[PDB]
Each structure stands twice: as structure tokens, then as C-alpha cells.
Amino acid sequence: MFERIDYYAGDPILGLVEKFAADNNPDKVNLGIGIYYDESGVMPVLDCVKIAEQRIADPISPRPYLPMAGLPGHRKGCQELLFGKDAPVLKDGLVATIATIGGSGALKVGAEFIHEWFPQSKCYVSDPTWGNHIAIFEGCDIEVGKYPYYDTATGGIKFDEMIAFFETLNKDDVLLLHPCCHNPTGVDLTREQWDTVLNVIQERELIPFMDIAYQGFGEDMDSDAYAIRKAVDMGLPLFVSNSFSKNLSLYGERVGGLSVVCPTVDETERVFGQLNSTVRRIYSSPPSHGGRVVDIVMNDAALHEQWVGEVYAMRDRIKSMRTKLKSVLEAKISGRNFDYLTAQNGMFSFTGLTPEQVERLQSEFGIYMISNSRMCVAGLNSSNIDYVANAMVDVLKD
Amino acid sequence: MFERIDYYAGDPILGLVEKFAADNNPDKVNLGIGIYYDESGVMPVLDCVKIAEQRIADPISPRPYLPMAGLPGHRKGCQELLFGKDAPVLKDGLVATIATIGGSGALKVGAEFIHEWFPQSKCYVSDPTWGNHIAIFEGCDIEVGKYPYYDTATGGIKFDEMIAFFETLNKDDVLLLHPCCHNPTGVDLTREQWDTVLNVIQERELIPFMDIAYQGFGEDMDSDAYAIRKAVDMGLPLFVSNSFSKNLSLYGERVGGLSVVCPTVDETERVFGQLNSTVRRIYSSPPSHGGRVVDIVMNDAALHEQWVGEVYAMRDRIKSMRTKLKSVLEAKISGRNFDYLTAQNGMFSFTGLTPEQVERLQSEFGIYMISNSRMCVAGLNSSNIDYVANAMVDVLKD
Ligand SMILES: Cc1ncc(COP(=O)(O)O)c(CN)c1O
Ligand SMILES: Cc1ncc(COP(=O)(O)O)c(CN)c1O
Ligand SMILES: [Mg+2]
Ligand SMILES: [Mg+2]
């Protein structure tokens, strides 16, 4: 019956974790997945989340469906985090926001909405990007291409090329953008680049579709949202998919949001309505448990403040890993430059290791990165840093 | 920017849920909603769930992504429940199963899979059906029609007509089937009818897509799953979306499954792979909280047994309300037969009231049913059963 159904090759990032469990090298190390681990190498349970879940757990409550859009306070916490507490665009009722099944479900609901209402829009993703952006958009029958971003040769951005490419795009073509903490390269635009990008976006009338899964891991919560809040100020038709997977350490609960910034309240009404309708035909409504945790942490003034501190500890450990690895590597290999390690932002780093050298890391050391050189900096900690730095030094010499 | 995006009319039921909210009759009763309430008229928290969630909160754990297919134990519990504990189809590795975001999410991933790999298949839903069914399949770009099912004239099934309509369909056209507890009518097929339906599907090479959202509410877990199990035994290419929303009383946590019965292990692998690819391009992976509740309740033998007793308590409660209702109707309305009220199974009942009779129940008694006569039997309990039954007697007598 199903003989023609192709095998699924598997998710790239996952068949790699698979491969990692199977290695029995003692000092092995997963730097391949995009998960935050702390100093001891485990996924934190945030204290704020812990309190929120104690509240959810007492009493165990009835479990009716959430609204299609999710919990009002979940959607409000997404909006405030992204646009700023009490931002004008929110006072004006100019953002249609739903809770979504992770940042992944936000991209999906946004792509389905775009596919339906702007069927001629094409989407362009950064070259390179998180592989899933492409499959999600294409899974909607949206035509997907790449804009020039990372410059392999310099490790910076092909800024002029990128802008030049934006200038060829049609009205309402979508650009799928990373406000900060680029994945996979860690190489981010400066504010000035953003202003330039957003000017082109306004001038060409493109749809900016910002995907933010690491807010608070770049510089701080507000700075990381610069490109969003500035698109807002510029009256752009900004779509924002946001994920709480990483900054709430709550991957498995599937908590994110999708927000669409509208010129007028009537358009918010129309967009919001259709967002709900698009939710309905997909999974009907989102998960209560994750919703509540977001609702309670975002809107409880003290848990909110605590959460911000916990996210910033995560942000700083990654920075100190970057700093530590850079100085370790620069002590141990002469005349090589690892500035990229500290110029990059967030969980990811494009190490500039060759696909071959990434192999050597697997085989000779049981250190896993993605073959494109992406490393998850959060996989490094003081117990493994010296073994990883050394394995890198070794591998940078055949 | 968005002026041309149609307003969304909202959840078809909300025209009712708000008119009820506004009704000022102090004895108003909302029988229009599709939720199970217990003997106290509230959504129950099941004791097995309550225990499962205390286990989830002790200790509060890290929240890594689940597999795209959900927890192995959640996938297993769905299989055993649906197909039978240690069923040959399971022991032979012939069921591709994923956890899903409720049954909605199962129907969605299934529909997308049919649309991707059987792009010429149309889907037929029962006349009448649970309207979300249609939107989910049409939202995949699948053409949707209906098969004759409910007989307005007799309160029974247009079985000859339904069968004759199946005889006209194309190989691989999909029938969305309700193995038991028909929604919205409560009118089910007998096992002999299933036998004939399944022969015709087999002879016409149709894809039976069984959607089981109320297992345990018809007769019992095994029997409710008769059609499922008979389809497997006959070797049909069965799709089964199951929902734990009603029977775990877990609506908001979004817990269901999708199972695809394959003729070989290799087909199992291709279909499973592709279900995972589908999940990936939609929401990446399912929610941990509801997933752990399903895993723990399904696979803890004591909890599983407690769960079955709890469901059968709901099953019996609804029957007690159908019996009492029937009994008052038969007593006060001479000559007229109400056997259909206790022949129907599950939460919903096509009561046989005309639309005019339904309008009179709202306007005269504040009793709210869907205009097609759909009444949620679980909405009735010792506090309102005499009121509702007497009001219906009045309305029928007129
Ligand atoms: C750039 C980007 N966008 C969105 C997401 C969303 O994943 P989730 O569904 O877990 O939020 C991720 C996590 N890989 C990401 O890296
Ligand atoms: C026939 C049928 N199928 C599937 C579902 C799925 O809803 P859920 O997504 O919560 O499982 C429903 C509503 N319980 C239904 O009535
Ligand atoms: Mg901590
Ligand atoms: Mg589609």
C-alpha cells in the first residue's frame, strides 16, 4: 500500500544526536543540538518555571480547551516581551497575537496565513538558516529562496549583496529574519544594518517575518528586540514568531507566539480572526500546561523579574564560554584568529571548521558539531572546555 | 495592508455559547457544548490523571523536546488501546504511530500525509459530521464531500444509500469514519453493518480513516474499537486518529494519536518517517505535559485500570441520563417511541426535535441544543434532568 512513500532521511540535527548517544568515547561531547545546558551540563529547570508549575500543580484543575489563540495572558506576555510593556502599538490594539506550538507552530501558522492571503508571496530565508524554516514554509506550498547573508570568506555578512538582493524582491515578498542570535552562524546585523535593512524593506514593501527564539541571549531583552521594535516604529507589516523554548527552558511544552502588527484596528480584527481560523484547522487550540507557565511567569511581576535574571545568567555563561574558548584556543594555536567566537551572539557559533575537520572531531574525539561548522556554545562547560579546545587544536592541523 | 483578509465568523458554536451566557432564565441549561461534565455538572479531573500529574510535579523535571512522534509510551498506549494489548499488528511492527495535538492534530497530520502522497484522493465525512473534520481536510487542499449517514425520517442510518455511495468512490478515496459514539447524532453502525461497510471499503480499495474521540463511552474499550480491529484483521490500509480529550478529560493538554496500519514493516518505516517529517514541518514536536500524562496513565497498570473504571463511570452516567430522559418522554408522550435515545451511544444525541422545537426549548426554557437537534447528553445531571425532560415533553406535545 505505501511502497512509494519515500523514507524520511530524518531531521539532520537529530540523526546527529542519535549518532552521539551511540559513541562510547568517554570524553565525548554534543555541540550539535540547540539546547541550553548550564555549567554542570544539564538543562536547567528555571526557578520561576518551578514556582509557576507548583502553582499549576496545586490544585490540579479541570483541563478545558484553551481559546484557539491561547491564554490571553500568554498572548499579552508574548506582546510585551517583544514590543515592550505598554508599547503604543499594543495600547492601540494594533497587533494580532496567538499562543502557538513553539516558535515552530508560529512560523507554521504565519506561513499558512501568508500562503492563503498572499498566495503569490515568495519567502526568503537567510543563507544559511535553521533548516526547519525552509521545510515549514515549503510545507505550506510557499516558494522559498535564500537571501545572501553569511560570508564564508570573512565570517561577517554579505551586507551589500544582501541589500541588493532585497532590492530585487516584489511587493509583499516575505523575508524571514533573525532579530538577533542568528542560527546557525551567530553573526548578527548591527542596529545600523537593521535600520538599512528595514529601510529597504519599507521601500520595497516586503513583509518582514522576524523569528526570535533566543531573546535575552544576545545583549538583553530590549536590545535583542531592536529590529522588531524599530519595524514597528516604521509602520512595517511585521510578522513575529517568538519561542519560549530556550529562554524559558521549556522546549517540550511547546510555547511560543505569533504576532502580526496591523496598520488599523479593523485589520487587526481580520488578521486575528484568520489566525484563529488557521489554528482551528490545524490543531484546534494550544496546550494548557505550557500556556499557564507562560501566562504565570510573564505576568507575575516578581516571577517575570526573576525569569529575566535567569535568562541573563544563561546569556552570560554562553558569553563566558565564548570568551574562555577563544582565549584557550588563542593560547594554544599560534597566529590563528578566533575573534569570531566573541563577535558572534547567542547559542550558536559558526566555527569556520571544515566539513573534514568536523569529521575528525567526531571520529578522533566524539565531539559533535554540525558539518556546516555550527557549534552550540551552551554545550561547552568548564568540565569539557579543555578537551574540546584541545581536540580543535589537533584537528586544525592535518 | 490587510484590508482584504476576510473576517473570520468564529467557532460556529460561539453564536450559541454567548447567547446562552446572555440568557436570563435562571434554569437555563447549555446542552449545546461538546465537553463531558460529570454528575455535578463540571468538567471532572480524573483521579488517574490527578495521580499522573502529581508524579510529573515530583520532581519538576527538565523539559527537553519530545521526539517528533511523542513519547514512546504515549505512542504505545494509543496502539494498545486502539488495536488491543499485545495485538498481532503491534507485535508485527505494522502500525506507524505518533502522538498528536489532540485528535485534531492527528486528523491534520493524517490529512496532510494523504494530500502529499495520495493527492487525487477525496475525503468523505458523514452526513452530518463534527464540522471541524471538514475544515481540517479542506485546509490541506483535500476536496471534501459527504456520505449519506443519518436518516432524518427514521432517526436511524441511511445504510443502503451510504453503501451505494461508497460503491461510486475511487480507489484510495478516504472515508472519515466514526467507529462509535457518532458525533453529532449518537447513531452508530451495528457490528454487522461495520462488516458490510468494511467489505465494501475493501472491495472498492478505499482508505478508511477512523476517528475515535470517545473510546470507552459506547460499550467498552474493546468493543468501541471493533471497527478498528476488524479493519486491521481484514488488512485494510487503516488510519486512526484517537483523542484522549474526553476520556482523559484532558482537552486543553492536546493529547491524541495517529496510527497508520501498514502491510509490511518496511511500509511502516516509510509511513512513520513521513509522519515525523509532517510533524516537523508543522509544530516540530508535541507537548510534554499531556504526553507524560498519557504515557503514565496508559502504562501504569493500576492507573490504567483506574482509568478504564473512570471512563466507564462516564459511559454509565450518560446512559443513566438517556434512560431517565427516555423514561419521562415515553411516560408523558403516548404512542410515540423513544428507543433511539438509548440505542444511540456516547455524549451526543440527535434528539429528533424539529428546528422549531429546538428554538422553543431555548426561548421557553433557556435549554440550548444545536438547531439540528444535537444535545450533549453529558450536559444533563440530577440537577437538570427533570427540568430538561419535562421541557422537552412540553415542546413535543405543544
Ligand atoms: C531560528 C529559530 N526559530 C524558531 C525556533 C523554534 O523551535 P521551537 O518550536 O522549539 O520554538 C528555533 C529552535 N530551533 C530556532 O533556532
Ligand atoms: C468525532 C471527533 N473527532 C475528534 C475530536 C478531536 O478534538 P481533540 O482535538 O481535542 O481530540 C472531536 C472533538 N472531541 C470529535 O467529536
Ligand atoms: Mg537555576
Ligand atoms: Mg497546504
Side-chain angles (χ1 to χ4, degrees):
Chain A
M1 173 75 195
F2 297 116
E3 293 90 339
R4 291 191 181 79
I5 300 318
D6 302 354
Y7 297 112
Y8 177 42
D11 167 61
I13 301 163
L14 194 87
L16 200 69
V17 178
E18 226 152 278
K19 280 204 142 62
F20 166 81
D23 184 43
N24 290 116
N25 186 321
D27 299 306
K28 73 179 189 177
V29 177
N30 204 340
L31 297 179
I33 184 48
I35 280 167
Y36 180 86
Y37 291 135
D38 64 14
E39 54 284 0
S40 69
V42 292
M43 180 173 288
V45 166
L46 306 194
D47 286 341
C48 52
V49 159
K50 185 169 196 278
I51 286 145
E53 285 191 314
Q54 297 161 351
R55 299 187 187 173
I56 291 155
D58 165 67
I60 311 286
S61 300
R63 220 62 45 77
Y65 294 115
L66 273 48
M68 280 168 298
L71 296 170
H74 178 147
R75 293 156 55 214
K76 182 160 132 57
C78 291
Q79 295 175 326
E80 286 199 320
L81 174 59
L82 296 173
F83 299 105
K85 193 162 52 174
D86 299 318
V89 74
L90 301 183
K91 299 173 154 175
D92 298 346
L94 287 184
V95 187
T97 289
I98 57 169
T100 56
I101 314 316
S104 291
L107 297 161
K108 173 58 164 183
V109 161
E112 284 296 10
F113 172 100
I114 289 168
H115 169 64
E116 169 170 10
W117 296 104
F118 303 93
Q120 298 317 295
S121 295
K122 286 191 198 67
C123 170
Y124 299 87
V125 301
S126 65
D127 176 15
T129 199
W130 174 46
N132 222 28
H133 279 189
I134 296 166
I136 292 170
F137 272 75
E138 287 189 334
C140 289
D141 283 351
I142 288 162
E143 234 206 83
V144 175
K146 273 163 207 337
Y147 50 89
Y149 187 73
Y150 183 72
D151 194 328
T152 312
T154 59
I157 296 175
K158 298 175 165 173
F159 189 73
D160 294 324
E161 274 140 80
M162 178 184 77
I163 296 292
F165 176 83
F166 294 164
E167 293 274 11
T168 70
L169 303 181
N170 299 317
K171 267 186 201 189
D172 302 339
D173 268 345
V174 173
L175 297 175
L176 179 61
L177 300 152
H178 309 223
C180 63
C181 303
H182 194 255
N183 175 13
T185 74
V187 178
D188 285 344
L189 294 190
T190 60
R191 307 269 187 113
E192 276 210 5
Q193 292 175 316
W194 274 119
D195 299 340
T196 297
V197 164
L198 298 162
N199 284 310
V200 178
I201 285 166
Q202 168 179 71
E203 206 273 309
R204 290 286 94 196
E205 305 187 59
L206 315 169
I207 298 177
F209 196 128
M210 281 176 197
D211 182 32
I212 192 174
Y214 307 93
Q215 185 159 3
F217 286 84
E219 306 170 75
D220 51 80
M221 300 297 201
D222 296 309
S223 291
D224 284 7
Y226 174 80
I228 295 159
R229 297 185 181 171
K230 173 75 165 180
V232 175
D233 292 345
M234 295 180 68
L236 301 183
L238 173 64
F239 279 62
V240 193
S241 44
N242 74 286
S243 178
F244 283 107
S245 290
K246 282 67 165 161
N247 55 20
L248 211 45
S249 210
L250 213 67
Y251 310 86
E253 300 293 2
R254 322 309 299 116
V255 287
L258 173 65
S259 286
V260 181
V261 181
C262 306
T264 61
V265 164
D266 181 63
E267 274 170 288
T268 302
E269 187 181 328
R270 279 166 185 280
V271 169
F272 180 69
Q274 291 299 331
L275 299 189
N276 275 273
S277 179
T278 298
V279 166
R280 190 171 175 274
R281 72 194 65 167
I282 305 174
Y283 52 87
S284 181
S285 57
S288 170
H289 182 88
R292 294 204 63 195
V293 165
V294 167
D295 183 5
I296 290 169
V297 174
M298 286 320 109
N299 295 299
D300 185 299
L303 295 181
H304 194 109
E305 182 190 316
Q306 170 172 45
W307 169 64
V308 177
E310 301 186 77
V311 166
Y312 293 169
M314 293 189 274
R315 173 197 73 180
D316 299 343
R317 208 188 72 68
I318 290 168
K319 278 147 184 206
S320 77
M321 296 295 98
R322 295 178 167 281
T323 285
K324 187 47 169 32
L325 176 60
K326 173 167 104 112
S327 70
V328 158
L329 283 174
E330 283 176 341
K332 287 170 136 77
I333 304 167
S334 311
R336 244 212 140 85
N337 188 308
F338 300 99
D339 286 359
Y340 72 76
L341 280 169
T342 57
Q344 291 165 345
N345 291 128
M347 302 216 68
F348 305 110
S349 171
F350 242 36
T351 58
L353 268 58
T354 42
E356 158 164 290
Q357 302 161 327
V358 172
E359 263 327 82
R360 305 263 183 280
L361 283 181
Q362 245 147 241
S363 328
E364 338 318 319
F365 297 93
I367 297 168
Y368 297 48
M369 312 171 179
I370 319 305
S371 48
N372 66 5
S373 89
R374 190 177 86 176
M375 161 188 67
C376 182
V377 184
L380 298 156
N381 57 59
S382 78
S383 87
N384 72 23
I385 184 67
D386 292 303
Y387 180 76
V388 177
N390 279 332
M392 284 183 64
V393 169
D394 268 41
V395 144
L396 290 187
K397 298 171 179 171
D398 197 51
Chain B
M1 170 73 183
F2 297 118
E3 301 94 334
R4 313 169 60 73
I5 306 295
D6 295 338
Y7 295 117
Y8 175 41
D11 208 45
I13 65 82
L14 261 65
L16 184 143
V17 63
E18 287 163 19
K19 195 200 299 280
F20 165 81
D23 190 318
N24 278 318
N25 190 314
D27 300 300
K28 67 171 162 186
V29 181
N30 194 357
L31 304 178
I33 190 126
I35 291 312
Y36 176 91
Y37 293 155
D38 69 9
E39 56 279 6
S40 322
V42 298
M43 181 180 287
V45 174
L46 298 199
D47 304 319
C48 58
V49 172
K50 182 177 171 198
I51 291 146
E53 296 189 310
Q54 282 156 5
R55 279 184 203 177
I56 293 154
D58 175 80
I60 284 162
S61 299
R63 221 66 44 74
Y65 296 110
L66 266 53
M68 292 168 277
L71 294 170
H74 171 152
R75 293 166 57 223
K76 210 176 95 157
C78 285
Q79 289 176 323
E80 299 204 302
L81 168 63
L82 289 186
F83 302 111
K85 197 183 195 62
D86 296 297
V89 79
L90 300 192
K91 302 202 144 326
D92 301 342
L94 296 178
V95 189
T97 294
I98 53 163
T100 59
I101 318 294
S104 293
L107 284 174
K108 172 57 164 177
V109 167
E112 287 289 19
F113 168 102
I114 296 165
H115 168 74
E116 180 172 356
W117 298 98
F118 300 90
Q120 313 296 327
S121 297
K122 299 181 198 77
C123 173
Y124 297 90
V125 300
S126 63
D127 192 344
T129 197
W130 165 64
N132 212 36
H133 271 185
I134 296 160
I136 300 167
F137 274 80
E138 290 184 339
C140 292
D141 291 347
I142 297 179
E143 184 171 325
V144 176
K146 324 146 290 163
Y147 57 83
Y149 184 76
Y150 179 77
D151 194 340
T152 297
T154 64
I157 303 308
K158 282 152 143 90
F159 185 75
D160 288 339
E161 299 87 328
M162 175 179 62
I163 286 309
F165 181 84
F166 299 169
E167 293 287 9
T168 72
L169 299 183
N170 300 328
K171 162 185 157 106
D172 293 348
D173 278 347
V174 177
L175 298 178
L176 196 57
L177 305 159
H178 299 252
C180 62
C181 298
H182 195 258
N183 171 15
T185 70
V187 186
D188 292 344
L189 298 171
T190 60
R191 282 188 183 205
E192 186 181 305
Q193 287 167 324
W194 272 121
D195 282 357
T196 313
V197 159
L198 291 175
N199 288 346
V200 170
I201 283 168
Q202 180 153 72
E203 199 269 339
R204 298 284 80 201
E205 308 179 78
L206 305 174
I207 294 165
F209 193 127
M210 286 173 195
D211 185 46
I212 189 174
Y214 311 97
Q215 190 169 1
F217 284 73
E219 296 183 64
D220 57 79
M221 300 306 179
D222 292 344
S223 290
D224 281 5
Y226 180 80
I228 283 161
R229 285 173 205 186
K230 180 61 183 197
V232 166
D233 284 359
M234 291 166 74
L236 311 177
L238 191 60
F239 284 68
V240 191
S241 45
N242 76 288
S243 169
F244 288 101
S245 293
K246 278 79 178 146
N247 57 31
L248 224 30
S249 199
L250 221 69
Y251 312 79
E253 301 295 351
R254 323 307 297 117
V255 280
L258 178 71
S259 297
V260 183
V261 181
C262 296
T264 61
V265 153
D266 179 72
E267 290 163 274
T268 313
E269 177 177 351
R270 300 153 174 285
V271 173
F272 186 62
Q274 290 307 322
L275 292 182
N276 272 254
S277 175
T278 304
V279 159
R280 174 62 164 171
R281 76 180 74 118
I282 305 176
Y283 48 94
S284 186
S285 68
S288 170
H289 192 87
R292 285 199 75 194
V293 175
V294 179
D295 196 0
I296 297 174
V297 173
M298 301 295 126
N299 303 294
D300 188 286
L303 298 184
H304 187 122
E305 198 191 317
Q306 179 170 38
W307 171 68
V308 172
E310 295 196 75
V311 170
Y312 292 169
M314 305 185 277
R315 181 193 66 200
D316 296 346
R317 201 195 73 75
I318 297 171
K319 289 172 177 310
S320 83
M321 297 290 97
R322 290 162 171 295
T323 305
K324 210 198 219 162
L325 182 63
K326 187 163 95 76
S327 159
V328 171
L329 291 174
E330 285 180 342
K332 310 284 166 65
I333 319 185
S334 186
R336 200 180 172 164
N337 171 46
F338 301 95
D339 286 337
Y340 67 91
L341 292 165
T342 44
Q344 289 173 357
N345 289 126
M347 278 180 42
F348 299 111
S349 169
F350 254 27
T351 53
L353 266 60
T354 66
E356 297 64 70
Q357 292 168 336
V358 174
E359 261 308 311
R360 291 177 58 200
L361 283 165
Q362 331 215 322
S363 73
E364 300 172 48
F365 293 91
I367 302 170
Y368 285 69
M369 293 188 185
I370 310 309
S371 44
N372 62 9
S373 86
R374 196 193 70 177
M375 165 178 71
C376 184
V377 192
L380 296 182
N381 52 52
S382 62
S383 77
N384 63 25
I385 181 58
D386 289 309
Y387 186 68
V388 172
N390 296 325
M392 286 169 70
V393 161
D394 287 352
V395 150
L396 290 160
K397 286 209 313 312
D398 172 42

